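Help wanted!
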Amino acid sequence: TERAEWLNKTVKHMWPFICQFIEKLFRETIEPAVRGANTHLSTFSFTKVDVGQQPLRINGVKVYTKRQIILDLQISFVGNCEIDLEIKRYFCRAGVKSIQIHGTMRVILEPLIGDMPLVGALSIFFLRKPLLEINWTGLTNLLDVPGLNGLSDTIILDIISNYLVLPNRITVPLVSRFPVPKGVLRIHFIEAQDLPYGIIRVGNQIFQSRVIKENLSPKWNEVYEALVYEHPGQELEIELFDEDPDDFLGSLMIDLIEVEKERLLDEWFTLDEVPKGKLHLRLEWLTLMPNASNLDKVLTDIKAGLSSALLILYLDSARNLPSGKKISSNPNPVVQMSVGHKAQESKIRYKTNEPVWEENFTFFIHNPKRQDLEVEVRDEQHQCSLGNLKVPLSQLLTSEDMTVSQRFQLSNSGPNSTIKMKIALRVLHLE
Amino acid sequence: DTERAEWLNKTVKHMWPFICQFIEKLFRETIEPAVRGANTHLSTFSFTKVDVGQQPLRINGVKVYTENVDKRQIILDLQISFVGNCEIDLEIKRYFCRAGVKSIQIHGTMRVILEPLIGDMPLVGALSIFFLRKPLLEINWTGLTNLLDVPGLNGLSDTIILDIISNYLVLPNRITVPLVSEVQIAQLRFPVPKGVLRIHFIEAQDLQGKDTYLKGLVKGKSDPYGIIRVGNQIFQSRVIKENLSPKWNEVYEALVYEHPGQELEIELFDEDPDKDDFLGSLMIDLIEVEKERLLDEWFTLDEVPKGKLHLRLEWLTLMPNASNLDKVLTDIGLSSALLILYLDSARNLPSSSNPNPVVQMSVGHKAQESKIRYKTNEPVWEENFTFFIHNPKRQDLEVEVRDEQHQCSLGNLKVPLSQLLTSEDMTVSQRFQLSNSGPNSTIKMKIALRVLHLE
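Answered by r_m:
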């Protein structure tokens, strides 16, 4: 690890421009995230974002040791600030008057290109869990808002802490969204020994096993598949519990870089923060393949549920949806998407026959040779159908990069009703 | 003072094959045309092979240059060393002459300028790369004697050629590396709305909650008010008391930029409630409003049994001239125009004796303020401000520079908006003189006007 005071002087000179970016980040990225987390937060807004005149400091730089460049920067930020919020519906005002931030900030240079500026984009995020301290003014006002009766000073610290780590990241294009995951982690939650149920976490993905009663060394034999978007830096987190009426039985933390190198591993892990306990796991790092050359063997191997492929859907927009002339006759378009059993929904657009979503959706696929994509456009206002689309996934198998991008014609709709999507397929293969 | 950065060296080494690709492109698309156009005898010159080897550049020292530094740039001095075997082959087809470089040494200081700095990621607009002084170079040739017999290089020597190559690496020559387009920078520091939405928040009717249990036997009539949102712009109406069919008759004007999926959001509430606070909501996609341009309808409120809201919505177009202003004024606290301000910087402000400059801007009663700069008589802001304008024929823009420390004025500027009406694109971009200030105090701004017309 090296020092870079020249980097500190650079940051110091850049500070007013960094502050401008932070303000933009708060108002155009963070604020919509807060507002859409709870219906009672719809009138939330930042009224002032001032982070002070003292810049963040970089205390150490290490290049992490193949088409990417990994830089680990030890960051320290201590300063007085004024970040004010307001929830007008409840006449609630509060603010942050000082912040402390200590942790390792990860900067990934990817992809490398054979022309200047040599780096296509930057990815900025914090490793592990960053250490933060936050002092409030009028915190009791925020905690009195209904729907937030579950929040505390502590809980807010955790939420903000988690907001700074993967899969969240600042993406910075250098030569001019919709990222394909760098891998899929298949988790065989097999067995334990000395001590019950388990909680399995990969980023925002949470799995909870079933409970076995009156049994030390229980057999769960469950399987979870988790998406990994940015690598390296995501981790596997496991916590085991017994029901008390909460009984902590041990924890596990696994850096995914280890799973990534040795593609497959089947080991017993000793539990942390506990005198006695071992956990039996089988971990598999699956590569997203842009062709179906391995599909034939993958299907055979899966037989004797499990996924052989991944569907990535970009919902762009739709036009000429069934409607009348006037706006009161216009629908509130929402899209339902499913491949077999699991269904997902887009956000709702209002009083329009030309809705724009630009939202991303991913579906795990058992067998793309036998499964169909079903897209259904509905009106939330009148509770009726505006059109539907059926896409056999086999159509993707024969497409270049296994992707299809167009404005599809809607069935059972208007004469010229269309929906614009980009649908992509990836085969999940070991090694 | 000067630091080493081995992490930077490891980075270069890992990036090296991609750097080599850039060098190859530089030779064939920049250097080769320069040679061919340098002498009539060199018109048939060409590189036949460009291989710079597998040994990476080395950085031996890094220093941030601090003296005489414009706040709009960052200056980096990098100590460069390159020692390695290579293969750079030449050809002059007119003289059927071939020669090559088999090894090079390069030692010198390479300057990297980060400019311009911008108030958004990636924070640096471009890189400018050149050597600060003539670097010490060693070049070993194969068939150099063949090249010197060429009539276009005849009379030249190994030493002279070294100087030419050495001089090629310094000013006015430089490598320019843009990170953001000029279009992005202009919109970042001077964004123009693609439209203005005028919202007539008139009245509602039958505003009743969903509670129904003992409602009306304990609590009185609701006191309805509205909260109106367009992006980050939020408006809140006044409260009407004890009326389920209130008339607000308020008007809000909202800037509309480029965002997909953007909507008009309205939620009605009670001032004096029990636990039931919600009186209904309304959402309209802005693409639909832009289509119909004008609309006057009653809308049924969502998430509520009974309730309707009366709105009149107008999509206003920004015109770069004043051809419609007279009629716009006739048709209409409504606005006929829009003012867009870019606050660049200031110089020679009245002054450890230096002030903490902040800028105050106003059009009548409407005021906006910049950020605070500290201990400087030459503050740089690069900030954006937008003003709604009732009548550009009668109103003035007033700009005032203040010292936050002593809480006093450092100078002021008055700009009649009628001056903009007769300017090209109704824009003025210059360095203005500050009144009631120092003898040579100035402020640099870009001022633009757009007329708001309903189409």
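OP: Thanks! One thing I noticed: DSSP finds six helices and 23 strands in chain A.
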